[PDB]
């Protein structure tokens, strides 16, 4: 009989549609059917009923039906003892929260955050992870700042990789939508970049990026030179995704320095050859990100754009279409701090012989914006035609 009810529940939740009055009655029937369930029955029936109620509240649009369903969740989960149902209820509250994010009164947000916090101690490493997820979305500003930052920061030293990663992710989520993360958190993020699991190193690198960007002038030696060096050292990571992410992040910390930024292309304390190492990467998605980040770093700084010319000219003769296009567009965008030159024009103009019509258009656009050498451009452009060249001829004449 229990199996038949489980089968009916699976069929109903498969065929149900929460989008398409009677919500009070069906919610109360789900509550009553949850109540009768004995201890040491099938927990999957209770999980099915909770996720039914959760979807039904995810599509509510009444501003009081939402609060009634949230009250049902609070009442049922405050007396729940099985950890599987508790973790699923946390995930259900999480799905309700991100689906609305605007419709819950602040008292209900505080109550849900407190209810999620109460499961952090007795959790089973799945309940704890889902509880930190719910804390991440439901904690507001000025109460995440005073209590939840420290409470989650304790769980960076958790015994489980999922719990550590979720603690760092929840700290990041609190930092995003307003919260004063203290600078003393920085030491806790750096030590989290030595974790054996990529899912923790990823969030730790995010947190180092965030902490170095908003406290740029803190000491211990300037806290964004340290963050720049730390993200530079993450270009040698054992995982491809963290390496791609570090290459993308390296260009976003604009307010770093001169003496530290100029180390990246000045090869031989962790930044001393980082962009050269990233440009000579075997993986395409790392080379592209390194080119884009170097373009961003050189867009504002003139001297770096001068010294970052030979490397990005090198990236022209790369036997991948996307890296070539990225280098060409980056040279198009940078082309205000640079003076072209005959030796550079040699390698640069050797790439005017491509079969696909993406490279020639973009490289025409590059030569139009860029500044004896005038002959060789005309010498090479005349061969390729024998629309794009004429427009490139119009702009080069005007300058």
């Amino acid at each position: 009989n229990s199996r038949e009810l489980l089968e009916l529940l699976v069929k109903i939740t498969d065929e149900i549609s929460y989008e398409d009055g009677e919500l009070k009655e069906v919610a109360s029937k789900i509550f009553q059917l949850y109540q009768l369930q004995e201890r040491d029955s099938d927990t999957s029936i209770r999980v099915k009923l909770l996720e039914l109620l959760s979807g039904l509240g995810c599509e509510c649009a009444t501003e009081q039906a939402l609060t009634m369903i949230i009250d049902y969740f609070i009442f049922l989960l405050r007396k729940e003892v099985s950890q599987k149902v508790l973790a699923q209820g946390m995930m259900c509250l999480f799905r309700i929260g991100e689906r609305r994010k605007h419709m819950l009164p602040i008292s209900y947000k505080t109550q849900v955050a407190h209810l999620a916090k109460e499961q952090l101690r007795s959790g089973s490493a799945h309940t704890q992870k889902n509880a930190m997820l719910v804390i991440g979305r439901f904690a507001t500003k000025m109460e995440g700042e005073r209590h939840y930052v420290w409470k989650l920061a304790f769980y960076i030293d958790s015994q489980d990789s999922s719990v550590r990663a979720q603690a760092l992710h929840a700290l990041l989520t609190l930092g995003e939508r307003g919260s004063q993360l203290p600078a003393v958190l920085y030491k806790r993020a750096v030590e989290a970049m030595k974790d054996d699991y990529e899912c923790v190193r990823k969030e730790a690198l995010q947190l180092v990026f965030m902490l170095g960007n908003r406290h740029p002038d803190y000491i211990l030696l300037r806290m964004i030179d340290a963050a720049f060096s730390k993200v530079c050292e993450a270009l040698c990571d054992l995982s491809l995704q963290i390496r791609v992410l570090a290459a993308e992040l390296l260009g976003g910390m604009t307010a770093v320095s001169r003496e530290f930024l100029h180390q990246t292309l000045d090869k031989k304390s962790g930044a001393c050859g980082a962009l050269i190492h990233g440009l000579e990467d075997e993986f395409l998605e790392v080379r592209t990100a390194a080119v884009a980040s170097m373009c961003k770093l050189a867009l504002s700084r003139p001297d770096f754009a001068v010294t970052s010319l030979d490397f990005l000219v090198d990236m022209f003769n790369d036997e991948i279409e996307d890296v070539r296009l990225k280098a060409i567009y980056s040279l198009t965008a940078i082309a205000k701090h640079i003076v072209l030159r005959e030796d550079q024009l040699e390698i640069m103009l050797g790439s005017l012989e491509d079969y696909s019509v993406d490279v020639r258009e973009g490289l025409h656009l590059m030569l139009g914006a860029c500044r004896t050498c005038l002959l060789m451009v005309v010498q090479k452009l005349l061969d390729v035609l024998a629309n794009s060249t004429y427009a490139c001829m119009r702009k080069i004449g005007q300058k």
Binding site: E7, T13, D14, M91, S124, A125, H126
Partner: protein
Amino acid sequence: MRLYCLSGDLAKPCYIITFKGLRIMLDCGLTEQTVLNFLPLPFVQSLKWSNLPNFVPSRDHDPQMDGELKDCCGRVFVDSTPEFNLPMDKMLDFSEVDVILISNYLNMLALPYITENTGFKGKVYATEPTLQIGRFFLEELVDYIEVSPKACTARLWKEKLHLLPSPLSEAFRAKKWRTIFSLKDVQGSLSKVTIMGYDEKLDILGAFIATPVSSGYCLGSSNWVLSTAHEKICYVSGSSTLTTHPRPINQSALKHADVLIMTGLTQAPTVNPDTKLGELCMNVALTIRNNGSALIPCYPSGVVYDLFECLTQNLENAGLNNVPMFFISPVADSSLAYSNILAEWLSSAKQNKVYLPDDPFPHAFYLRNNKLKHYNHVFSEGFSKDFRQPCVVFCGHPSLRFGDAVHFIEMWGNNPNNSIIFTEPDFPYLQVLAPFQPLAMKAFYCPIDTSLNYQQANKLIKELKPNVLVIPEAYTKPPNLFIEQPDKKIITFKCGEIIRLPLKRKLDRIYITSELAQKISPKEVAAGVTFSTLTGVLQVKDKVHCIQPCKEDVLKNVKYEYGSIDVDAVMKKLAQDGFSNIKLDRTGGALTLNLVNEDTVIKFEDNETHIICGGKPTTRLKLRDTIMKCLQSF
């Protein structure tokens, strides 16, 4: 552990198991058989699929449902895009899933539906050939559907199925049918896959070890083994026992599983694949001899590699030469080039042909001559120059609802000397060519499938001897084509069942250091078993515990007392120590000791010894050591 069943199609599994706080998906596959309910999708085509008669189901009609269903002189078909079927999305949320394990490329084609726009954040694990050939298959489905597309404008039949006639009135779900994923969805989905190899032993988040173990079925096909130091779960999907070009079955490492999940059998089990290959070659030679052509609808990288070789051998031994073959598929050059890269994944006969620098597959030779040609499509440039007849064409989709193959059915259809042969059991052939029924072409249907008919599967299971055997319900169901193992228990899952498998963890592997191991003091308590008491400080740090040596002031000194003392031990050994004035109240079930040095009483029960009255501290210690010297301790 649970087992969530998410797939009602026996050929295309999708299961979820929960082993240790982790949800693992096994083989997210695509049900392609629902495309046969729709009409064919030709490239550029005449008024044959236009001006088809409407279907009115003899009862109350609607102004809207008319035009959605049209008949093809015996049968009813939906005028819409194919709309594939997929695993159920609400038994679990696809973001709870932490790891997806893929066995074949064929059991792979529903991955962009799961990984891309859901909340999924985990890893995907497969071998290198499964990822590459699954990339070919996904790119080719997207290509075929996007070459000459239609519009999804046929919803109203779905709400009403009892009206409609026999074949599509049993549509399984039909409201969760999805049309197709896109190319950038393919790119994003396959970017989450990480290459593994045979017998790699990769650690999954500290919870267990995953290992693919080479089911000898496809290029890179594998069976999966999840292991801890005390459990072993084995998943068996592809599994061919016959000898053919992939690396043969490794049943050594499936040997002592606690749970054995079995999924994929022949789907044509009364059939010998070798004699069906022979009938294929006989039929194609006979239609070549009669100045006809042959069309073999096929997958781009499956048994076509064997079809080429066996076809050339039998045709040239039949006195036929200069017979052209064309491979027409938008991934055919990629497939033919990539197939000769995989010498390490092949059987011995083909693998040995690369130590001497030769091509392991013969069809590369056929490309250095002009016996085998390949084109992206029938409209591709250069095809019209090299096309000759009679010929054998290996072309697009076996379903005949999209791809190059549809075109051929229009062109070769009305000549009786031409012939189709269907070699895929996943597509009933009389269902497949149902909208082509004024044909007059031969359409022979010789089914090749080398994957474990029931008589081999019974032998495999009773050779493996698992503790538990978890199978679909249709397997244990009657020519005695059913799995019976009377000496073991069989658990049985239908389409939408959560089944609660019986595997209970009782032990866990931890470590101790040398000093605390030295501190151990064994004491013989029974025949071949000794006891000791352990205390230390724990450092888990992932799941790998380690017991270092040391409210820790008294806790690391505790022993335990066994061997309840007898009557003639305490007073006999307490009389002569210096206190020989023992008063013994020997009550009918207990003993009581009164003593004169201070007010104290020692009460003896057959399972408990205790004191009541105390005094100055030295009074306790004589009782202490006098009791302890002749009572057993750890």
